[PDB]
Design a protein around this ligand. Structure first.
Ligand code: ERY
Ligand code: GDP
Ligand code: CA
Length: 295
């Protein structure tokens, strides 16, 4: 694989320090290779795991084009090389806030989970408010999923019905979901460009736990911004959720009075996502997580 990497890089006019090549296999869509070029700059090489690379990454690249065009408070991958055989970009500054350990079923944290630095929330709030305000509507030909506020609500309604039809859903959980769907005042009246897979493994931080970059824009779309807040709630609890909401609101992010409550209900719909992923991915672990999560 190392020899293959060097050759693939060479074909794309990328020349590496062989001794620096390291593999990261945590991605389900790409093998990721870290390597320095001959000027000592750190690169990430995305080697696709499945065919039809161009069609399958078109959406992500459109989102990255928007972020690279508009955003200044955080870095996002800037694909200098982009072919069916290789995506390569300069590695973002900083390190992941945490990485998922699948055996343990939780994070290996770079930050102190018992004393989370308040700068993490302040900086993530800035990042998300900037991201969610990007004017995606100004693009001439976007292939991203784009929802109005009403469409985002109907999307959830439909996704829930589809999960119910295939997996079934416990009566009380279903009723909670429906109460959320039916409560007008809880739903946001603005949507935005989201990252869609915001979590510690994708949030790059500096030594002070400032979020300085976001990787992996596979799930980018224009919809309810709430999905980008779920990680804070699940990792840090209500306090971390409140801190992020506060920072986001105060820097000018779209805020509505029931935003926290809405995000908590979205968190209660976590099983929808697990069930969907089980279906598309065929990964046994997600199938069993889905069965237990749906009750
Ligand atoms: C707290 C600690 C837990 O972290 C979370 O709850 C975060 C906050 C989830 O994101 C939350 C929040 C959010 C928005 O994703 C960031 C949401 O979509 C998912 C379902 O749950 C993560 C990351 C999920 O991943 C995402 O699952 C998607 C179905 C696909 C997505 N990706 C490959 C396309 C992928 O990253 C998912 C399912 O939990 C991963 C599996 C492996 C786990 O069950 C692990 C062990 C988690 O319980 C966790 C680490 O312990
Ligand atoms: N530290 C760091 N890790 C990265 C970077 N880019 C990718 N990775 C790692 O490589 C993994 C796979 O790349 P990613 O684009 O997420 O691929 P996917 O998960 O298959 O869609 C990521 O989840 C990270 O763990 C980067 O700029 N910095
Ligand atoms: Ca990833």
């Amino acid at each position: 694989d190392i020899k293959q990497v060097i050759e693939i890089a060479k074909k794309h006019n990328l020349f590496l320090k062989e001794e620096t090549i390291q593999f990261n296999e945590s991605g389900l869509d790409f093998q990721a290779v870290f390597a320095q070029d001959n000027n000592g700059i750190d690169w990430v090489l995305r080697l696709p795991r499945r065919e039809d690379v161009m069609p399958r990454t078109k959406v992500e690249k459109q989102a990255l084009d928007l972020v690279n065009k508009y955003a200044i408070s955080f870095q996002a991958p800037n694909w200098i090389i982009y072919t069916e055989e290789l995506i390569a970009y300069k590695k973002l500054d900083g390190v992941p806030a945490g990485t998922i350990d699948h055996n343990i079923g939780n994070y290996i944290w770079e930050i102190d989970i018992n004393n989370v630095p308040e700068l993490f929330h302040k900086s993530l709030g800035r990042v998300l408010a900037e991201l969610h305000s990007i004017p995606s509507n100004k693009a001439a030909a976007l292939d991203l999923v784009v929802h109005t506020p009403e469409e985002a609500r109907m999307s959830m309604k439909q996704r829930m019905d589809a999960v119910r039809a295939k997996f079934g859903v416990g009566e009380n959980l279903w009723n909670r979901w429906q109460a959320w769907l039916n409560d007008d005042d809880m739903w946001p009246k603005k949507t935005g460009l989201i990252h869609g897979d915001v979590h510690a493994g994708h949030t790059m931080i500096d030594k002070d736990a400032n979020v300085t970059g976001l990787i992996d824009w596979t799930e980018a779309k224009v919809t309810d911004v709430s999905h980008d807040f779920i990680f804070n709630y699940r990792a840090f609890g209500e306090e971390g959720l409140e801190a992020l909401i506060l920072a986001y609101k105060e820097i000018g992010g779209y805020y509505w009075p029931k935003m926290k409550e809405h995000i908590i209900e979205l968190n209660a719909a976590y099983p929808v996502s697990i069930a969907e992923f089980a279906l598309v991915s065929g990964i046994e672990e997600y199938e069993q997580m889905a069965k237990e999560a749906l009750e």
